[PDB]
Amino acid sequence: STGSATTTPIDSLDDAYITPVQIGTPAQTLNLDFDTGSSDLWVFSSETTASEVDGQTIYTPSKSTTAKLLSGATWSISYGDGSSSSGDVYTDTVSVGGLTVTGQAVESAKKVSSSFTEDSTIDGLLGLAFSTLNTVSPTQQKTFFDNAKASLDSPVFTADLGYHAPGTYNFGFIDTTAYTGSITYTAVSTKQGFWEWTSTGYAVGSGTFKSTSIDGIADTGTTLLYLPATVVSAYWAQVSGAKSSSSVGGYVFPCSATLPSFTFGVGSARIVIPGDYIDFGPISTGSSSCFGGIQSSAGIGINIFGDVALKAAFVVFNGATTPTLGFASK
């Protein structure tokens, strides 16, 4: 089997991407944030505290003839941005782009933090990291990909995120029309539960490539590119007027600037992030200070190849017995 679904930016900055997902019988379609940095499929629901719902589409398990309460199971998650959610668990039929999993754990939110309430375009998350990070207790649950894997033509999914445009998540096959050149594969460590790999270095603009190992995670659920302070300083030093602002919470730059590109290494290959992808616009409405898309990871504890980086590539998440990642230009 295979599946193929279009993923669409939630706003003009590509702050996140939503993908339609069918849950239950008859189908209830919710727009979920596919997140390769976490492993819980959770949704706004008929159980979510009413004051914490503001425009989202909810899953109502009592209207699904295939929903079953997973007795005793609870979940609670906190994300790197400080957001969180928690609730109870149902199993139900979940379909993405024509690919159907029966018995998928659907985590129903009883509580969500303010940032989720405030984003009316995201109805929940669909985790695609390794199932060892799933938060369901006392019986940990499998991700949608883990459940589908055995049935897929090939045990893979791919992320093809657009810049200011829709893109595609495919399951079970690699669309050879969707990228240029060849795909370069690189080793993955699953020890932290993430799609964790080691980039071979970087370049700023037309500058010479620096060979240096950068361990980080491929995370579709993070907007920006988070890299060591040395690397980020070298990038922003090439932008007149750019500076790190403690009051704003990162590097800012004059909105009048033209940004240089940023290249990262995948083995002997190179992925080029155009400068425009690094512009996240005014820090507040009407300001001439703009927020940078490359930021320091020094306060995180891990480097994160988020959407800024991934949307410059066609990315293969290979869930074979020994997982690997593949990157191609496009």
From Swiss-Prot:
GO BP annotations, alphabetical order: proteolysis
All copies of the Peptidase A1 domain together span: 17-328
- The SS bond pairs are 255-290
Reaction(s) catalyzed by this protein?
Hydrolysis of proteins with specificity similar to that of pepsin A, prefers hydrophobic residues at P1 and P1', but does not cleave 14-Ala-|-Leu-15 in the B chain of insulin or Z-Glu-Tyr. Clots milk
Active site per UniProt: 35, 199
| Gene Ontology molecular function, alphabetical | aspartic-type endopeptidase activity
Its top-level enzyme class, in one word, is hydrolase
Instruction: List its EC numbers.
Output: 3.4.23.22
Q: Which UniProt keywords apply?
A: Aspartyl protease, Disulfide bond, Hydrolase, Protease, Signal, Zymogen
Which protein family is named in the record? Belongs to the peptidase A1 family.
Q: From the Swiss-Prot or TrEMBL record, give the protein name.
A: Endothiapepsin
Q: Which organism is it from?
A: Cryphonectria parasitica
Write the span of the intact protein that is present.
Answer: 90 to 419 of 419
